Design a protein around this ligand. Structure first.
Ligand SMILES: CN1C(=O)c2ccccc2NC(=O)/C1=C/c1ccc(C(F)(F)F)cc1
Ligand SMILES: CN1C(=O)c2ccccc2NC(=O)/C1=C/c1ccc(C(F)(F)F)cc1
Ligand SMILES: [Fe+3]
Ligand SMILES: [Fe+3]
Lengths: 287, 287
């Protein structure tokens, strides 16, 4: 039983429901080739200057990722393609609104580009959020997913190069005795394609067996605005922020947020008023 | 059966365990009279110029609070007593650290001064966070509290003036069939005393029957860093922020946060580094 593939331009409303039922979906041509090329181009140097995850020079080192992994987050300052095309993607927003309607507003928990070097070993099967948000493990099983992850291929995902393994239907599992690599299916994708999974979906990066190929992806974790993000955009220059759309500003934490409660009082408010209104924050102002 | 009253200076380790078991506790002399006096002095103007909760001039109106209540949050820039004495209170930090060890770092969800005018009606029994964080409702019942509320009396709490009603043991309730004002006990307090309750504790503001007395309190909601705060400190002048201690900076969202996960990757980080290191934020620098 393989992962469901859906069109990003045709069968839309079918994406979230599909992931909901199966826990994983592949969205063909989520990003266009032109968009991928610009992103690749823009982040290229930052990826080459990124040290190992657990570098000693970091005060918040990542001890979970392998030494052959380079992860670059806080992409709004680095790339125009990400902060304009990606953050405003209509397909992403429709999927998110469908997924998080019961909770309310959603934002970016993390936007990052990941590069796996040649001979990168396979990760152990896991679920996202366990190393940052312990609260998630205390949610009731029928609770709707609080975060989802868009895994966009910036390069080819093949069996030989480490394409993502996924266990279909495991987002609903309560007993984890059944977890094994034998229950997984692969996510073979071309650049621009995206694998969508919920925070409860068991999966893992594959093993790179060629010794040649380098795999890159853009990982976008979207979550309800009630959860603190992994990355911060506080230090992003005002001009950049003021250059984005109000929607993008909100996803980045530069706006107040709302919940689904009928008489919602809001998040990140300032004495009854929004962050943006208090600060008279401009939007869509070019550099 | 009345609310347990504990000393803030002696029986310190008994406060959290007491609240955990009973859902509420009075902490006598949580703030000293000098601190209270300064706080009152400092926020007095902002309380008098505050409009009704659902003022039409606000973009994030509060339709739940009554029209005779004035609520003023984002207190760091207004008061030195709050931002220095209160945010650094040793009692508060020992309580929070004991409450939230399971989850990790905690911060301020909201710091607010509340004033109730004469003849303020009694609120309906309720639980906090329902109009802002719908996620809380999907937590398993054995999940440790994700937020707690310090209700500090800035004026006297009497039966006649509207002192807070609480239903002891109601934080462990799954069935809300027997919720009634008849199950409640009062929190009679002198200025500086604090009523501590969990997010699951059923309570309500009392009715002020004198027609003359005004009741004021400082409400402080402390929650795990994994939940988004209700108030934002983004627009607080940097000098002010750079004036606080590092701990206070963290409680205000002007620092990166950590969780209890063994190989924690952190929250609000910037490419492996903290907000404070990235921005080279100064601390304890007088105005
Ligand atoms: C730690 N971590 C991340 O760094 C991360 C990286 C990109 C996008 C989301 C993301 N969120 C997480 O919770 C997370 C899970 C995770 C990664 C690797 C392994 C290993 F085991 F394989 F190593 C286990 C678990
Ligand atoms: C809306 N609300 C607050 O404004 C608030 C105000 C100060 C400190 C925490 C706090 N947390 C909440 O989610 C909340 C609960 C709440 C207040 C009044 C009533 C009424 F109904 F009684 F009014 C009901 C519910
Ligand atoms: Fe993962
Ligand atoms: Fe309340």
């Amino acid at each position: 039983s393989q992962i469901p593939r859906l069109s990003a331009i045709n069968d839309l409303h079918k994406i979230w429901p599909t992931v909901e039922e199966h826990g994983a979906a592949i969205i063909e041509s989520f990003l266009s080739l032109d968009i991928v090329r610009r992103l690749n181009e823009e982040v290229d140097p930052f990826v080459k200057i990124e040290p190992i995850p657990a570098a000693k020079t970091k005060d918040h080192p990542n001890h979970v990722l392998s030494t052959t992994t380079r992860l670059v987050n806080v992409l709004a300052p680095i790339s125009k393609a990400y902060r304009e095309d990606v953050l405003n993607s209509k397909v992403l927003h429709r999927i998110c609104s469908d997924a998080f309607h019961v909770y309310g507003d959603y934002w970016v928990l993390m936007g990052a580009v990941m590069e796996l070097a040649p001979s990168n070993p396979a990760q152990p099967l896991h679920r996202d959020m366990r190393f940052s948000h312990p609260i998630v493990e205390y949610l009731k099983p029928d609770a709707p997913a609080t975060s989802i992850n868009f895994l966009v291929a910036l390069s080819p995902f093949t069996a030989e190069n480490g394409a993502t393994h996924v266990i279909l239907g495991s987002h609903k599992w309560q007993n984890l005795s059944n977890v094994s690599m034998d229950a997984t299916v692969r996510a073979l994708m071309n650049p621009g394609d995206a694998l969508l999974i919920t925070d409860s979906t068991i999966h893992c990066g594959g093993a790179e067996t060629t010794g040649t190929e380098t795999r890159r992806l853009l990982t976008i974790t979207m979550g309800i605005s009630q959860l603190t993000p992994l990355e911060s955009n506080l230090a992003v220059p005002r001009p950049v922020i003021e250059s984005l759309t109000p929607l993008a500003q909100r996803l980045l934490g530069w706006a107040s947020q709302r919940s689904a409660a009928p008489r919602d009082i809001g998040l990140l408010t300032i004495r009854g008023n929004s962050i943006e209104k208090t600060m008279n924050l401009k939007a869509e102002q070019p550099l």
